[PDB]
Amino acid sequence: NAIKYLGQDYEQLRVRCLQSGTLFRDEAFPPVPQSLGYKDLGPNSSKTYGIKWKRPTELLSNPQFIVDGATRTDICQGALGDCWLLAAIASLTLNDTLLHRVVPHGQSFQNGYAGIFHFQLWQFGEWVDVVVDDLLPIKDGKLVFVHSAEGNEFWSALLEKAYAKVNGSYEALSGGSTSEGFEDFTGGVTEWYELRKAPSDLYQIILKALERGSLLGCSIDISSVLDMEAITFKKLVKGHAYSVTGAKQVNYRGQVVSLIRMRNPWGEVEWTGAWSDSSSEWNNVDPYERDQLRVKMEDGEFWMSFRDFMREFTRLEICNLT
């Protein structure tokens, strides 16, 4: 079983608050400026203007922990440079066993609610159970940091808060490497591929890793500080972590074409080239494969041919449990 982070015992704390008729207040990570950050999100920073702390039960009538599953569409980046972490969370949702360890299902804002939630994180070689109270940073009535596409779903906001807590602040998460999130969610180890010097069986490696439930991510190198977050003509984002979420071969124009699916953790802004949501390539695939694979939705998720993926992306990471 998990070690209790800072000795905090989720069930004992929840039970005490429920018996006291009160809501949990986390003395280890309070709703104070220092929990937001120290410089860019520091006390005298314009970027913290109007940010307040509110529980979901102070925001909406029927807040939910999980709605329609804990899935990758629940991961929509906010105003914090933690794309690496959010790509890791989205990839985690594809591994059902690890997802249910990291995110204890059954926590609720209704029955048994006492303003306290918990998550499991892999930290310094061990699983640890991290509690948070459910006060979250809000500006203009909306979550400022990660949020779900479902406006009344909070498991991912609370998971990001727990990750901030073990790092001391939200700002501590701004700028990072996806491998750290992958490993902190799985206990596995990340292998890095330079796509210019990829083995000839990389596609099969990707297929098998997705099938096993490994966590995969990819990115485009920057050439200078100016390329950071630059949006290309075909609406890829440079210096930005993507989740690799699928891979399938389809019959197309008399050949077998290998496709790969990835997801921008913004939850919006997608590739516009071949195999994009509205591209003409789907006209020439099997109608069942078209129905199984293609979703016409601005959700950050899209397909590319493996050939285009190797032309446009620079790096791939595969975090295997093994």
Query: Per CB under 5 A, does 299 bind Ca ion?
Result: yes
Report phi then psi at 123, rounded to 5.
Answer: -135, 125
Q: Are 274 and 307 in contact (CB under 8 A)?
A: no
Q: Would you state the torsion angle of the CA atoms of residues 252, 257, 262, 267, taken in this order, to the nearest 10 degrees?
A: -10
Query: CA-based Rg of the chain, rounded to a whole angstrom?
Result: 20
Query: Quick check: is 283 catalytic?
Result: no
Block residue for tokens 């005298």: 44
284 is in an annotated binding site: yes
Q: Which of 83, 147, 218, 319 is catalytic?
A: 83
Which partner, Ca ion, ligand 89K, none, binds residue 10 by CB below 5 to 8 Å per kind?
none
User: Of 224, 89, 64, which Cα lies nearest the Cα of 145?
Assistant: 89
- Nearest to ligand 89K of 26, 301 (CB atom): 301
77 Cβ neighbours under 8 A, 6+ residues apart: 83, 86, 146, 265, 266, 267
Query: Quick check: is 95 catalytic?
Result: no
Tell me the C-alpha distance between 302 and 246, whole Å: 10
Q: What's the min distance (Å) between Cβ of 24 and ligand 89K? A: 29
- Nearest to ligand 89K of 30, 175 (CB atom): 175
Among 68, 96, 126, 227, binds Ca ion (CB under 5 A): 68
308 is in an annotated binding site: no
Block residue for tokens 């800072």: 6
Query: Quick check: is 240 catalytic?
Result: yes
- Nearest to ligand 89K of 82, 184 (CB atom): 82
Tell me the C-alpha distance between 56 and 274, whole Å: 41
Give one word for 269, left, alpha or beta, with left for phi > 0 and alpha for psi -120 to 50: left
Length of the chain: 322
- Nearest to ligand 89K of 63, 267 (CB atom): 267
Q: What's the min distance (Å) between Cβ of 153 and Ca ion? A: 5
Site string for Ca ion, 241-280 (x = CB under 5 A): ------------------------------------x---
82 is in an annotated binding site: yes
Query: Per CB under 5 A, does 74 bind Ca ion?
Result: yes
Q: What's the min distance (Å) between Cβ of 293 and ligand 89K? A: 26
Q: Which of 76, 95, 118, 264 is catalytic?
A: 264
Q: Are 242 and 232 in contact (CB under 8 A)?
A: no
DSSP class per residue in 136-154: EEEETTEESS-B-SSTTB-
9 is in an annotated binding site: no
Q: What's the min distance (Å) between Cβ of 167 and Ca ion? A: 25
What SS3 state is found at 201?
coil
- Nearest to Ca ion of 13, 146 (CB atom): 146
Q: Are 119 and 103 in contact (CB under 8 A)?
A: yes
Per the structure block, which two tokens stand in for 188? Answer: 């596995």
283 is in an annotated binding site: no
Block residue for tokens 């029927």: 62
- Nearest to Ca ion of 34, 152 (CB atom): 152
The separation between CA 272 and the C-alpha centre of its own chain, rounded to angstroms, equals 23
Q: What are the residues binding ligand 89K (CB under 6 A)?
A: 77, 79-84, 174-178, 219, 228-229, 239-241, 315
Which partner, Ca ion, ligand 89K, none, binds residue 67 by CB below 5 to 8 Å per kind?
Ca ion
Q: What's the min distance (Å) between Cβ of 79 and Ca ion? A: 21
Annotated binding-site residues for Ca(2+) read 77, 82, 284, 286, 291
Annotated binding-site residues read 77, 82, 284, 286, 291
Q: Which residues bind Ca ion (CB under 5 A)?
A: 67-68, 74, 277, 297, 299, 301-302
